[PDB]
Design a binder for this molecule. Structure first.
Ligand SMILES: O=P(O)(O)OC[C@H]1O[C@](O)(COP(=O)(O)O)[C@@H](O)[C@@H]1O
Ligand SMILES: O=P(O)(O)OC[C@H]1O[C@](O)(COP(=O)(O)O)[C@@H](O)[C@@H]1O
Ligand SMILES: O=P(O)(O)OC[C@H]1O[C@](O)(COP(=O)(O)O)[C@@H](O)[C@@H]1O
Ligand SMILES: O=P(O)(O)OC[C@H]1O[C@](O)(COP(=O)(O)O)[C@@H](O)[C@@H]1O
Ligand SMILES: CC(=O)Nc1cc(C(F)(F)F)no1
Ligand SMILES: CC(=O)Nc1cc(C(F)(F)F)no1
Ligand SMILES: CC(=O)Nc1cc(C(F)(F)F)no1
Ligand SMILES: CC(=O)Nc1cc(C(F)(F)F)no1
Lengths: 416, 416, 416, 416
């Protein structure tokens, strides 16, 4: 294994089209559900193709039509639960209508929609047309105490949004760059600047950023994308997007499965071309000195994974927080997060590199025995999926006692 | 004027949508001529919109139809010759058919086409389906002695081309990345890797690279591009392409002028987001130590242009070679090259940043007097076009005696 | 705690004379024993002042005179063994005469000397006038099987030595730059170049390098050093020397204790001025990718120690090898190595940053219980010596089973 | 000619003792004159050995004894004026007594001394015990209007001096690090920190810094220096000192000429080991963007000198200011400054790299003819001294009209 080039120009000159990527795919895929992909049979196919999140668009349709979509997604998802080693969690996301002309943060219709999403147990909310930090605080208040674990992703879609960006990011759980709407309010040749500014600031803060709208638009009518569309998805992944989103392509178009399969192939290839040497150097130089044990353990773990070219980082997590701390240093290796909390496993799709697995097994009596069981479970999953094989090296992160907030141990172990 | 950020991540975070670009546009625009843009009236409009090069596609049409296209381009071009300060040179390029199925380097039909282009006085040839260095040597031999100043740009469009790339680049004058054809021969998710490898190697060699095919494809039917198409043109400019090319958009589509105007606006905006501090540092570290005076003068001139934030670099040139040496260091400022040779002025469109001007005035008796005349001419052009105004600072490059190969002097002068 | 400067020039500009150093002193001190410091009473004072190694010079004196020096050093050393928390191990080193005029690698007299040092149980040998790798192999053969754990440090002292340096370094355990002799064989204004070349190559190989001769020479006659002597010791520490050596100053001079105390104060101050940000970045970029678990754990541990500003790295070691792997990344924090092997504890003085402690306690029945005992012992030592206090953060390195070669675990723990 | 290493560690590893330095010596040599070196015969020998500046110490002696020293230095200097190509200018410097116990900035005795130095036409004043910016303003006021061109170098020698350093540097023309006195007022192990902080800040401001006291102290009694003294002079040159100073060694000692010759040899060797690639990169990143033509020309000239490995930079100067602007970028090549002003030629010894030459020839009638004469004079000097030979490449800096402040032209020319 040869070292990475010393300059950015030398790195580019060395890229190779005869060099197979690794089996894992770090970037998450979000699909809009609509007339062309509502059926249980089609949804089973989208799941096997690589869909992680199902977005429902509350611009159209009644509550009763939407509740029958949520039921089909869940049926499709549980059809795979028979074999715990190959089961994939799938999140559900609710997109609001917002202040729209066909004005206040949350309209009267949006109250009803948000309140409906707490009852149906969704994982995240995409709030349309956010202009200031007090709009996010309004949405957090309508979800109440019952929905205090639902994540809010703020949609940036006008000039005021871009100008007040830093205060919106401090209030939100994540950001969505909404290129369609944004490309009407500002001049279209400036959209690429707003996109890169916003991906840059979220990477620096360690928060999730989603790139949306018109990514594979020609695949509505034809089964292959144009040359421009292939380069637009790759460039979002190389700038640093956590997830990419399909709209029309999966909702209304003629080839929903081919579009999901195209995003899977491109993203995997772009991930092998990241210049990891310079990116990791910069995120370190920019990290605070702090007495927090969990932060010190995460940066240790990422640093060791580069030195031994490991096949994975295995993290045990209750709330997700330990896996989110490893993911902000952007390792090359996949992060396999093992959890017993089903909602923690659905939300972990928003962070780049986290591959979440749900442990079904009952708690053992001896606590050290319970810990070994979950580590062995994560080894079997990585073997079945082809992330590594017997005799390879993995990093394992754990804590010193039960409960959240005590991750402090990093081990380097051979795959049994 | 504040200094550039110390890291790449910090540079991204600081991009601003409320920051007007400079008037100059460094990247060249190549348009295909066909049924929708053959007329003298439409060509006059394309020239004012920003077209620098006219490509003729010898896949279709007779010699007699093509000769009437060359006559209309030249008429349109000379219609502006009345005012020497505002005249723009426009190059003509001949694209061969190549070994095509609807096999040797140059077919029998291609002999006739190449020989036709020497008689019509074209500036460059785009040779289709180049696989090895001995294919380029074949094309150079058919042009003969009469066409020894015609530039050969090699089209890379299959797996063999990509594998033998380094020897093709040493033989050619320039390279074209032909994404359409290349995206069938290799898997479509790998095209973006071949593109970046090839732009990287040409920047390192100081040779021109052109990015072609499907860049604004939706503008055939609609007057605005999709969000993906806007980001694909910007990313080619940020990777380091010298020129971008329109095909269907200008040949067959419904909105040829709008497509030329869209490429002009995007390219200007992307040029203001280049991270010049790191790019110039890398090209220097990679440059040979050599006893050549002209090379030492060019790097001096580029270095001074960053320190005083100059409005232009003015170069007097016979063969073009002095301007090509400044352009490989990628200055922020425009390079105004003043020449008396009309063919040197048409070919200078292939290098990023060169704005060529043709001096019409008769040679003065005293040689130092002739030199001052051409420098004053270049100052008037920059004033009329809005690159700078009275009291600004420009760099002026000249030589110590007449003839090619003696550029050795750099001055810093206020605009009179 | 503010981040380090972004450039070397900015780092220099920020040094401060009103900024107290940390209590630990990373660089080791080697003293020559002679007429002025042979007594048990004076040696007790040298030990408390900071001496780690006692060098015997076999140019003069009989075997019987030397054996009485070794007995006084050992008496002085064991006088402190009553309190296990405050005991300091002290190594003994035997310096050969070599091929000297007042010729083969090992003279007949040197056989007798080497064979005498195996019987007296020394820790290291300083072999004079090494010219080629086959000279080191000769010395290794005379020590035999009985002295296979004695370390060989090669003395570089002529032109041939410097020219064949790379092959001598691969054969040796460590290197000594012998400036006195070297400054006669090569021109004296070139000695500083040979010194920096040799410190550079040993840091790159992760091997110990010692800087010797005329460091505090004026302190033979006067109780204070000259301004030049103060800057010469600091500069050896900033280039990267593992240890510094006194000769005349402690052997023959009038102020042996003041000279030991001066070296202690200077070295401590120079260690606080190292530019750790750039040094750690370079040693990483230069490190091989390897499947060795112990290497991956060490670089993880050093990386975590910078992020949480830890007060120490605690390593359990049989052979020393785990501590030597942490030391080559040059942490800011002290490395406390806990061992049961007394010879491993004496030899660890040759590596920068290792503070060795000898565990006296009997082996516990349960192996995990034995491990906790030795970690607690190292915490008490660090508390007594003032390296940290209750509530601070330390890194602890251990293995998964008993025996050498299985270090694989890194924990971050609060001081109890 | 191979490129410099990519890292600082790699640069160190590549230093070579079998690699001859260039003939030029960039760092200036300052000698104290006293009983052992007052005679005309000995001073002629010191000049040929490499002395640039003669310091008079006004702690002892009457005005009448000092005036006879100034007369012998000037006689010795003019003895070489017969051949204009080989003449070396020599500056005279007056060191004050200061507020001393054996209190105000300038004592009553110091008024008399300063006023005496204006009458004797000295070039610089070394003001003892400067504590605040208002002390420098006091000295500037006593020199008056008559001595407004005399340079003030401030001596830093206590704790208050170091704390208020930044305001003292803005008021002064240059700084002297006075290690002898400073090493009593602060603890001696901290002197090396104060030295590096102060050299760093002066390099950043582009002002001269002198390193003084106890540099070759053992050469008072013996004809060779100790190993520590050889490394102390080299390290001041590698930190970035403009000049080094001898005191006792030339004033009172037994071997004045050998001491001057030792400083010459060491300094020449250290200059060949500077890591120019990183140093020039940092000084550029730190330089302001400004509309000043002279600054833009200087950085252009230094940048071209690295690219063509030139043998010299030739600058025509009235006040010195154009040469001082080239010197702050620390070129590898010598700067030959040609002047007609004799006081400008003596003061240019304080800046690293400037080799000043005095033109004696009468002004020509045609101004362009006068300019060519002085450039030819500088070529002959460089040939006689061995800085280059026929066919080599030099950089030549000039202005567009007569008078100070119009340098704007850089040429690359072969040596005739
Ligand atoms: O939610 P988080 O902060 O990621 O916490 C992870 C926690 O999981 C553990 O590793 C195991 O805890 P449980 O046995 O309670 O699941 C703890 O030791 C650690 O503190
Ligand atoms: O063709 P090139 O190498 O760019 O040469 C530029 C040449 O033009 C000049 O600047 C002016 O020459 P002309 O007067 O002959 O046009 C020369 O001094 C210089 O050598
Ligand atoms: O000699 P080395 O390679 O430093 O080995 C350190 C070894 O010490 C241990 O940490 C403890 O071992 P012991 O109980 O046998 O002393 C092992 O787990 C580890 O392999
Ligand atoms: O004193 P400075 O600023 O270094 O000025 C250098 C000046 O010397 C010149 O090069 C020559 O001037 P003179 O002929 O008056 O000596 C000017 O063109 C330039 O402005
Ligand atoms: C934002 C960014 O990093 N872009 C990029 C990366 C590359 C590559 F060279 F790494 F692939 N090209 O463009
Ligand atoms: C190849 C390359 O440099 N890509 C790139 C640059 C940027 C920007 F941040 F400079 F704009 N983003 O992607
Ligand atoms: C070899 C080396 O690193 N030298 C050095 C370091 C410094 C300081 F600035 F870091 F202290 N000065 O000189
Ligand atoms: C301050 C400084 O730069 N010190 C230094 C330089 C070198 C060398 F390696 F460049 F020589 N060693 O120590």
């Amino acid at each position: 294994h040869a070292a990475m080039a010393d300059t950015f120009l030398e790195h580019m000159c060395r890229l190779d089209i005869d060099s197979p990527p690794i089996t894992a795919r770090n970037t998450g895929i979000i699909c809009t559900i609509g007339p062309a992909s509502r059926s249980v049979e089609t949804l089973k196919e989208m799941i096997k193709s690589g869909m992680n999140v199902a977005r429902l668009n509350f611009s159209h349709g009644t509550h009763e039509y939407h509740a029958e979509t949520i039921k089909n997604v869940r049926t499709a998802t549980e059809s795979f639960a028979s074999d715990p080693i190959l089961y994939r969690p799938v999140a559900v996301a609710l997109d609001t209508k917002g202040p729209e002309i066909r004005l206040p943060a949350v309209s009267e219709k949006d109250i009803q929609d948000l309140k409906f999403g707490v009852e149906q147990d969704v994982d995240m909310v995409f709030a349309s047309f956010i202009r200031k930090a007090s709009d996010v605080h309004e949405v957090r208040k309508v979800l109440g105490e019952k929905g205090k674990n639902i994540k809010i992703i703020s949609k940036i879609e006008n000039h005021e949004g871009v100008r007040r960006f830093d205060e919106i990011l401090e209030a939100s759980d994540g950001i969505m760059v909404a290129r369609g709407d944004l490309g009407i309010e500002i001049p279209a040749e400036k959209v690429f600047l707003a996109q890169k500014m916003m991906i840059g600031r979220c990477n620096r803060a360690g928060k999730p950023v989603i790139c949306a709208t018109q990514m594979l638009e020609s695949m509505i009518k034809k089964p292959r994308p144009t040359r421009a569309e292939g380069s637009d998805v790759a460039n979002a992944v190389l700038d640093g997007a956590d997830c990419i989103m399909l709209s029309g392509e999966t909702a209304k178009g003629d080839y929903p499965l081919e579009a999901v399969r195209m995003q899977h192939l491109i993203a995997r290839e772009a991930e092998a071309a990241i210049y990891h040497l310079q990116l990791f150097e910069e995120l370190r130089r920019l990290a605070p000195i702090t007495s927090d044990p969990t932060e010190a353990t995460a940066v240790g773990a990422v640093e060791a994974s580069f030195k031994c070219c490991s096949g994975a980082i295995i993290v045990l997590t209750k709330s997700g927080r330990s896996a989110h701390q490893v993911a902000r240093y952007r390792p090359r290796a996949p992060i396999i997060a093992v959890t017993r909390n089903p909602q923690t496993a659905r939300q972990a799709h928003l962070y780049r590199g986290i591959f979440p697995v749900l442990c079904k097994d009952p708690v053992q009596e001896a606590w050290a025995e319970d810990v070994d069981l979950r580590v062995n479970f994560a080894m079997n999953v990585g073997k079945a999926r082809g992330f590594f094989k017997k005799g390879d090296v993995v990093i394992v992160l754990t804590g010193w006692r039960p409960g959240s907030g005590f991750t402090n141990t990093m081990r380097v172990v051979p795959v049994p």
